[PDB]
Symmetry: D3
Subunit: 256 residues, 6 copies
């Protein structure tokens, strides 16, 4: 497809070793999972996996980042409106819970997802149903829940904004991501992984010379694995077939 994320649990480091260990624990289960760590540390891929090697791989998988949807529509996107009961609901659409009936569904920066919405959220993981936008009726739903916030919820609770009964039911399996800069053993490795995706995205393929590679083991990766993903995609279309490096990368990681 067009996604921009890949095989990403490749790795030597003990860092990523133990995050794989984490994954073993919880992989038999239908119970909820919470992924914590900085953004762009490959959370989605961690989830996407849990799906496949679940008992429900044959079903669907819905990602929804609560970030990018505005606040007002957030309810219909998730639950669904029968045409008319929402001022300007022209379509009899389905929510993502409708959609994910069968497989699992993925939630991004839950710490973002508003106080009003997270209440209803509590229901459906206790209620076993939900009511569409403007409907007195409850609908049966088999769905496994995975969610990922970049933020700390222990402090989201004290501050109020997060309800301590959501949290109680989502921490059956904590998994804690490691930032890429704690994983530098593993740079090289997935860089291979990368051009092996991209080689079949665009005309061409690149290759990093050792010069720029060490240089990439230098950097911060505040944006982590996602940041790097963006970067490799750029050059793979920018100079295709070419070597890469030595200093053909952004003037930023010009590192000694």
């Amino acid at each position: 497809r067009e996604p921009n994320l890949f095989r990403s649990l490749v790795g030597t480091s003990r860092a990523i070793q133990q995050v794989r260990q984490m994954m073993q624990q919880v992989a038999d289960t239908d119970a909820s999972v919470l992924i914590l760590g900085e953004s762009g540390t490959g959370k989605e891929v961690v989830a996407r996996n849990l799906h496949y090697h679940s008992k429900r791989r044959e079903g669907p998988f819905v990602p929804v980042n609560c970030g990018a949807i505005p606040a007002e529509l957030l309810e219909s996107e998730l639950f669904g409106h029968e045409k008319g009961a929402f001022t300007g609901a022209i379509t009899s659409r389905a929510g993502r819970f409708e959609l994910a009936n069968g497989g699992t569904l993925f939630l991004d920066e839950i710490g973002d997802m508003p106080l009003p919405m997270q209440v209803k959220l509590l229901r459906v993981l206790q209620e076993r149903t939900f009511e569409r936008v403007g409907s007195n009726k409850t609908q049966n739903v088999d769905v496994r829940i995975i969610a990922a916030t970049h933020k700390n919820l222990e402090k989201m609770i004290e501050d109020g904004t997060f309800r301590e009964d959501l949290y109680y039911r989502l921490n059956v399996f904590p998994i804690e991501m490691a930032p890429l800069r704690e994983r530098v053993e593993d740079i090289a490795l997935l860089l291979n992984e990368l051009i092996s995706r991209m080689e079949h995205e665009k005309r061409g393929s690149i290759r990093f010379n050792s010069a720029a590679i060490m240089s990439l083991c230098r950097h911060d990766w505040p944006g982590n694995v996602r940041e790097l993903a963006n970067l490799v995609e750029r050059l793979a279309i920018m100079h295709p077939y070419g070597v890469i490096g030595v200093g053909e990368l952004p003037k930023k990681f010009r590192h000694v």
Copy 2:
């Protein structure tokens, strides 16, 4: 092997078309062939072919450029010395006529090959034999003769140095090469041919960007196809995997 010459009769141009036409004429035959044209215009390859699609492909093929051998040894290299009859002949070696018995044998810049030697040469293509260094005996030899001089023999005759009975027996099939710079339709074409050899010579492979390619269609090629061959080999080891161009080639063909 380690040779540095290739598939080289690739080509659109009428120039190389008619040199292929030439090849058709003479390809059924066991009779001698003379190839004329500048050096490094791929003569050898023209011969090497005539061999394969002869009736004798299953036999051998000996190249000898009269240039690079010194003058004194020229006779033993070609005819062979029984140990002792040459002051310091420690080995009972064979000549190239011994060697090429069966297949064919290739002679470079015949215009170079000394007056003394070319006399004996006349013999064996009339004599049907030759005598080794220091031997009263004649040896039966089945060999087809191909030869290539960069120089004009019509003027080698008037000036003396070439015997008009050699020439009479070698022009059963003239073939006249076209200099590469008369063949620029065909640059691109064999450039492909080239990295397809070299890709399996060294680690890597290159690729020319369109920038440098037009730039290569500019140049003289005084050294012709051979010159270009040397050039592609250089960069294929120099920067491997990389793009080539735009101006990574020698400061020479920096051409607008």
Copy 3:
């Protein structure tokens, strides 16, 4: 996808060199471009490029050949009908200007596009808006315009049918295509380009022997690059894996 056009600005010839030169001129710009030349001389590809290496590659690209659409619908296809204001408009569709908001949009044989329609056309490149089918309202539109007529407009003007103010605003960048038969240096080249597309279209791959290739450098190509494209596609499905040639091509280019 299923298109049947490719990498096609491959080429040695000065012909295609200067048509690439043309492309350099106008590639920074948002201003209109007019491509002139015979049909099937690869015009679309010339446009498609200008898009990618524009500032708007990330947007869309809409091709519409005024030829194949009938005359009556031509307005709604381009501007769009709100259900009902067109006798039998059941759908609230969008036009191609709606569609191309963001990227650029491509027009074929403008010399065909009727007198009535080209008037409205003038508006939107001056008006900065357009009104849908049966709507009193104007809609803001950011779109760059490229168009290609096989016909001569200087004579389309004298004859009347083309308005001299369209033409004034479309000739900011003329580009003039070269017919394939003026580009025979370049046949071979893109023939490679071709089986390298098609090899991943169908089971198999072909290859042209030198016999049929020279034979293809013979031909007219009244249909030019498009004609050849059709031809290679045919055999690539007709005899797959096979050699091609010598006379397995249509009895037409049977050429000495």
Copy 4:
């Protein structure tokens, strides 16, 4: 290398299944093996295997077909002459027993190998040594023996020519080859095996259309697997890249 034999124990048929069964029996052993069957039924390959999956793969393997060597030299080729003790022995050469010390050594059409020579042969597999040409000395030799005659020895014994004590020591493990025409399940299979060798022998690769393949399942194969090997090699150089068939093969197997 240049051999012309391959992976050839590929196969569905019960015929070749049981000849593989045979191979299992005897594969642990250092004791002699006799392979019986028509020529060109791939005997050598059957041996070559037994070597590799012996305990001595790390050693050498010498093939000698008693056929192609003349009768007089047969002794020195096998045992070796110290320069001078053979009228015209200029070289202090080694025999094949010298040579195969370590690995194993392969003998073809033993039924051919003369009465005089097979006597000495008996010695070394009992004697544990041999004496070079013109030497009073015996030399220690560790060698495993495999041999293959196209002919029946039970009748070679009655007729005299074969000694009943050779035979007694060589039938520790009989293996009996199946003629290719008893193995037609398996044609297709190794035909794949074939172009997968040859594809890396010469420029190109071929492919058989279904037409000619059934046609090849028709034929006798008096020459068996070897015959077919010769055949595939021919076309792989004859028409390269091309389809093969339908009737591009020799006018012989033109079969309905």
Copy 5:
């Protein structure tokens, strides 16, 4: 796409040879074809072919297995409902005859397709039209008919359930499939065919060792080619990159 069926008329055996012979007979024709044999013996592929090498390949191809659709909807799926004339017909859908106008349409286990429906069926292959769900109007239709029942119709007729005038018009070309277990020459062959599909379905590729292959030539294949297809797909995702066998397959075909 996601189908799970392939190149499947690969084969040595006389069994599959004559089923290919069958295909030759009827391939010029627009007249109806009936395919008989057990399920999962690759019927669809036999049809899909007849399409391509028909005169109508450029058109569409609709498969409909009368099995999996319930009984009540069977009419609208095939003929199509204008919104409203069917209690709960919200959509103005098309039938498969609408759909297949142009190409051909495929019917599975006709022996299943109910008495009521097969009457109307008779009409359209005589009537040259059909009437949508709840419409007094007849619609012109150019469609070629192929159908496949696992069951015997001669006994479907005596028992009643099948009308002897359907049958009369469908047996212009009988083709009779051979069960896979009558085709064991051909196992190996298409197994190759298989990983060559699947290698481009999922990450990886497998390979069968000879151990498990003979073991697969053992089995029943009550499910025939389809059964095997399911099987190869399983392991290709189960253990990817790995060898397969020896006993990594289901405990079922554990065969001596």
Copy 6:
């Protein structure tokens, strides 16, 4: 060829980074180089490189491990005997200094190379010549010297056995290898490097599952890179095409 060593300066770790740094220092030079570190830590490859990116790549390279040659012959192997001046010198052979005239020559565990021999050694790097076995004559020699001892020479000096003037002239460029177990960042990396060699050594190719890989990052590598090289070669012939791991490796690195 048949060597069993590869591309081996692949690596993330600071360990191997600084050993590459070392290499930069000394790469312009003709002066002697000493490589210290445990055996099997890839010393040869470190040298082999220095050659290529020297000014003398176009020349030869001779490896001689003083270990495996016995003590008595050590002089002729290095210097060369004219037939007769050594009791049983039948051949007029050349030494390795003869041989390496032009390129460079490599010496293994110099700490092994006997007191007698290392004296003469001193000469030639001061003398600029050497005398063959049994010759009053000195021969001019242009050779660059690289040598590698597993042992510590500072203590080889105190103990006597190593002469403090050898050492003075060999430490123009020290390079100090890092044991593989200090380089575990880099395991994975060169493991790739490995099957990419071996894939073209034997039929097949393997692949390590993540299971066994972490397990390989566990181990000691007393034998270091060489040890691992031996290991990968083993399985690449042992189980070919297969996965490797999880515990198909020797019962030794069975590591938790």
